[PDB]
């Protein structure tokens, strides 16, 4: 397998150096500009285009198309590492969830809780759309493109991403990142003071601190 550290540096190089002959050929480095907007919280999602990557490294594009999930995580971490370099400005406080984070910083002075951006791939122009019948089991885990008609859509629901608890006795806080479709919550304090004294303090979950994302379910059908 590849060294994902080397791949991380290659991705950083792409973000740092790529220009699409952009802004009417003025070569203003589209992804650098995007990183400025992301750093100043002007924008949330970032759609990286695989046709741009193909100009420098088609083998990287092929590496992405199979086992896409690894490269999703990789690109997200690369963007988080590069974001402070494109910052120059202090942003105004505008969200209760971030007021909690600000209090947490003030008291301190995991990264998943702070990572307020989304990263998605726009498919390479080589890949023609499949019909819903041709997405067979040899395509598990691979990036695909599909075409059809929508039949049903749900309302938008809050989906849990990381839970935040508080302890009645010791005044500390704890975190629990969520990935599977289900989880089991915490009960009793794992901090060293409570544990060593066996003082039995309980954990209360805080909807003012935990992180949520907009989630919706949909169905699509053959022509």
């Amino acid at each position: 397998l590849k060294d994902y550290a080397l791949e991380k540096e290659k991705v950083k190089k792409f973000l740092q150096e790529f220009y699409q002959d952009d802004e009417l050929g003025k070569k203003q480095f589209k992804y650098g500009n995007q990183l400025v907007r992301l750093a100043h919280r002007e924008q949330v999602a970032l759609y990286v285009d695989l046709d741009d990557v193909a100009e420098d490294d088609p083998e990287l594009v092929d590496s992405i198309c199979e086992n896409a999930r690894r490269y999703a995580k990789l690109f997200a971490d690369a963007v988080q590492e590069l974001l402070p370099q494109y910052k120059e400005r202090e942003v105004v406080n505008k969200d209760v969830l971030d007021v909690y984070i600000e209090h947490r910083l003030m008291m301190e002075q995991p990264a998943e809780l702070m990572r307020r951006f989304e990263l998605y791939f726009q498919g390479p122009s080589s890949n023609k759309p499949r019909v819903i019948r041709e997405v067979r089991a040899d395509s598990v885990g691979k990036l695909v493109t599909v075409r059809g008609i929508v039949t049903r859509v749900s309302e938008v629901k809050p989906k849990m991403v990381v839970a935040t608890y508080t302890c009645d006795q010791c005044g500390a806080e704890t975190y629990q990142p969520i990935q599977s479709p289900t989880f089991m919550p915490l009960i009793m304090c794992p901090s060293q003071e409570c544990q060593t004294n066996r003082s039995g303090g309980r954990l209360y979950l805080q909807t003012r601190g935990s992180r949520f994302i907009k989630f919706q379910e949909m169905k699509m059908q053959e022509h």
Partner: protein, 87 residues
């Protein structure tokens, strides 16, 4: 295994015991004549607060019984002679 915590003499003469007691009241204030009830409430409030530092497992009355029994031991007298007068 079975590392059960309990309040013995060495824990009682530790910093959160008598030394912390000696320093907790020098910030307090009391109102005196005709206010003895309120002063007692304040005193007991600080005492329950202090006791919870030393061993956060027992109720306050049970803790007082343990201290009343444990005060008999020579180990706390070796520290009492320092707390009284000076080290």
């Amino acid at each position: 295994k079975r590392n059960i915590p309990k309040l013995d003499a060495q824990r009682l003469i530790s910093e959160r015991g008598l030394p912390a007691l000696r320093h907790v009241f020098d910030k307090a204030k009391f109102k005196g004549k005709g206010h003895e009830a309120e002063d007692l409430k304040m005193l007991i409030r600080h005492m329950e607060h202090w006791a919870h530092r030393l061993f956060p497992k027992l109720q306050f009355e049970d803790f007082i019984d343990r201290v009343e029994y444990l005060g008999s031991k020579k180990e706390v007298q070796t520290c009492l002679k320092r707390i009284r007068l000076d080290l």
